[PDB]
Design a protein around this ligand. Structure first.
Ligand SMILES: Nc1nc2c(ncn2[C@@H]2O[C@H](COP(=O)(O)OP(=O)(O)OP(=O)(O)O)[C@@H](O)[C@H]2O)c(=O)[nH]1
Ligand SMILES: O=C(O)C(=O)CS(=O)(=O)O
Ligand SMILES: [Mg+2]
Ligand SMILES: [Mn+2]
Length: 615
């Protein structure tokens, strides 16, 4: 067989045998084992610069940073090409794409046979969770993309240290990735190799992940969505814990009390911005710190609390919209040591994306850019055609340690206790600014039935309302109704300790006015909603009972420093009977689709809401 170039520190015979088998299948020219060092990162970045995949940014404006632009067919997740291949179709469920596992294996085998001819296979060892901690899991991703390798260095704990934990007998999650663009002898490569045919396949019984044809984000960084949500959610269902599409933040009030909250918003619907928000005027003495911005692993303890950890090591964040007013901690995070994907290039070798003009002299657009497709871009082109200089799903990749608001426990494997959960989708209508659920069951109902308008984070038509239970529609690794039951059963376990359960809130930052602009300013002003949640956690916040739960009155929030009237508050908090009647019929359609194993508690809760609407 091909020389694996196995390092001496790899002591795991089963791992080596699996690599050998994948090398025999994929047939790369050579094999390279990533050690995770800073020096290797620099070498791989230089290799990407030579291929044209990276441009090195101006070191005076953006130190040790790089810009990649991708093929326009490969800019986002492809949900229709993503599969849960469980043994039984009912363990994938109606929210997932299923194929009989032997039939998927026969489909993928000819695609992966020889997929890496002409390329290097990079062996990318990584830990999700702190290295060697009781809650961490180790994965090995084989990829023919050095872009994957350098992004995994930032997003995970990557490299040779993993093999001390694996030892001789440790188990690992097996991940195989190819851009699906094998190269014949002497063939010239493209700057962003990919395939218009794509598959992202999970076999839960074996924890195998196979990815074909995409080099982009969640399709190709397999530790993130594929393992730490899809495979992990399955493991959690079996072992009594949760893997959730949630930020985790700490918030300290002026009395020095610190609380932690976990919030599930759908893809490109506000988590990263919320997870490091800066308290605005009126909140002297408050602080907000980031534990994670995207994935949370959560389990209950004997003390009746829920403990959350962030299994990632960095942020893979949406760039457009980011500036010193919307997310200054993010702006400071990406000052250097960052990879940017599909943003624009300034004449001086810096990066630009829509939204940055809010910090510019005269708040004006740059005179000239190279947009993410390599085309000349100007304010005149943008005015006449609406051309975006940065793709709407353009991303930065940056280490968590760049974040000035990073929580000191961000990598503590003991986790943080969650005092409240927040769920919220992108809804132009219907859903009020913030609602507290009256019980755990009603909160699970909130989360199970939430809707959200599609975004550029996956391909397809944006702006369409769909059901997105728990913000996990693209990421649930088993039947969604069983996952609802898991959340209900978790609540009963917590309550049996005698504890008070974490409260569950619904939020909506995204109500629109008649011109399609947002009625609520959002971003740092979301602190004013968070502060009410903290008041409620302490039993000092007032609220009014309405159809869907308990909501603050105008006087229950701090408006110091924000010009937002009681009339504007009434608009975004009023419960509209007609809109909620329509919404509950969309819940009924979801419950028909999810009939199999649907918890009866959900239909019971729906009936109670219907009574309150008809009262
Ligand atoms: N109007 C408004 N826009 C927001 C708000 N928060 C975030 N956004 C915008 O929504 C987009 C997505 O925000 P993110 O915070 O990156 O979303 P995310 O949930 O982290 O998305 P993923 O990383 O894909 O899971 C960006 O363009 C933000 O500028 C908000 O409170 N109000
Ligand atoms: O789409 C999301 O929810 C993301 O966090 C980005 S990706 O990792 O799926 O590309
Ligand atoms: Mg994010
Ligand atoms: Mn996400």
């Amino acid at each position: 067989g091909l020389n694996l170039n196995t390092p001496a520190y790899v002591k795991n015979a089963k791992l080596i045998a699996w690599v050998a088998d994948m090398v025999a299948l994929c047939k790369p020219d050579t094999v390279y084992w990533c050690d995770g060092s800073d020096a290797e990162y620099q070498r791989l970045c230089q290799q990407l610069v030579d291929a044209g995949t990276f441009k090195k940014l101006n070191e005076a404006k953006r130190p040790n940073s790089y810009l990649a632009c991708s093929d326009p067919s490969d800019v986002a997740r492809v949900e229709d090409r993503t599969y849960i291949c469980s043994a039984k179709e009912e363990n994938a469920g109606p929210t997932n794409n299923w194929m009989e596992p032997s039939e998927m294996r026969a489909t993928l085998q000819p695609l992966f046979d020889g997929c890496m001819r002409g390329r290097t296979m990079y062996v990318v060892p990584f830990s999700m969770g702190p290295l060697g901690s009781p809650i961490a899991h180790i994965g090995i991703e084989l990829s023919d993309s050095p872009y994957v390798a350098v992004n995994m260095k930032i997003m995970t704990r990557m490299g040779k240290a993993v093999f001390e934990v694996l030892g001789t007998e440790g188990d690992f999650v097996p991940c195989v990735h190819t851009v699906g663009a094998p190269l014949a002898e002497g063939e010239q490569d493209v700057t962003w190799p990919c395939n218009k045919t794509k598959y992202i396949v999970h076999y839960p019984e074996t924890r195998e992940i196979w990815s074909y044809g995409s080099g982009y984000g969640g399709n190709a960084l397999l530790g993130k969505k594929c393992f730490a949500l899809r495979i992990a959610s399955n493991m959690g269902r079996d072992e009594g814990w949760l893997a959730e599409h949630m930020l985790i933040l700490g918030v300290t009030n002026p009395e020095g009390k610190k609380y932690h909250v976990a919030a599930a918003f759908p893809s490109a619907c506000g988590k990263t911005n919320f997870s490091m928000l800066v308290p605005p005027a009126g909140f002297d003495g408050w602080s907000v710190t980031t534990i994670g911005d995207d994935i949370a692993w959560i389990k209950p303890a004997a003390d009746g609390k829920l403990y959350a950890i962030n299994p990632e090591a960095g942020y893979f964040g949406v760039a457009p919209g980011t500036n010193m007013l919307t997310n200054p901690n993010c702006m400071l995070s990406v000052r250097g040591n960052t990879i940017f994907t599909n943003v624009a290039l300034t004449d001086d070798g810096d990066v630009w994306w829509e939204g940055m003009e809010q910090d510019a002299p005269g708040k004006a657009l740059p005179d000239h850019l190279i947009d993410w497709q390599g085309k000349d871009w100007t304010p005149q082109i943008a005015k006449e055609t609406g051309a975006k200089a940065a793709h709407p799903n353009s991303r930065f990749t940056v280490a968590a340690t760049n974040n000035p608001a990073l929580d000191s426990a961000w990598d503590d494997p003991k986790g943080v206790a969650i005092d409240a959960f927040i769920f919220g989708g992108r809804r132009s209508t219907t859903v009020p600014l913030v609602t507290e659920a009256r019980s755990w069951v009603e909160g699970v109902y909130m989360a199970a039935t939430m809707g959200s308008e599609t975004t550029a984070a996956a391909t397809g038509q944006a702006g369409v309302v769909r059901r997105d239970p728990f913000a996990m529609l693209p990421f649930m690794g088993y039947n969604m109704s069983d996952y609802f039951q898991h959340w209900l059963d978790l609540g009963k376990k917590l309550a049996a300790s005698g504890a008070t359960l974490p409260k569950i809130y619904t939020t909506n930052w995204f109500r629109k006015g008649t011109d399609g602009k947002f009625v609520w300013p959002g971003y740092g002003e979301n602190m004013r909603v968070l502060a009410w949640m903290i008041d409620r956690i302490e039993g000092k916040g007032q609220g009014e009972d309405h159809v869907t739960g308990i909501s603050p009155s105008y006087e229950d929030l701090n408006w110091t420093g924000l010009d937002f009237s009681a009339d504007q508050f009434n608009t975004v908090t009023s419960i509209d009977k007609a809109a909620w009647l329509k919404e509950l019929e969309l819940h009924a359609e979801l419950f028909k689709q999810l009939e199999h194993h649907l918890p009866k508690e959900l239909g019971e809760t729906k009936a109670e809401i219907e009574r309150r609407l008809a009262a």
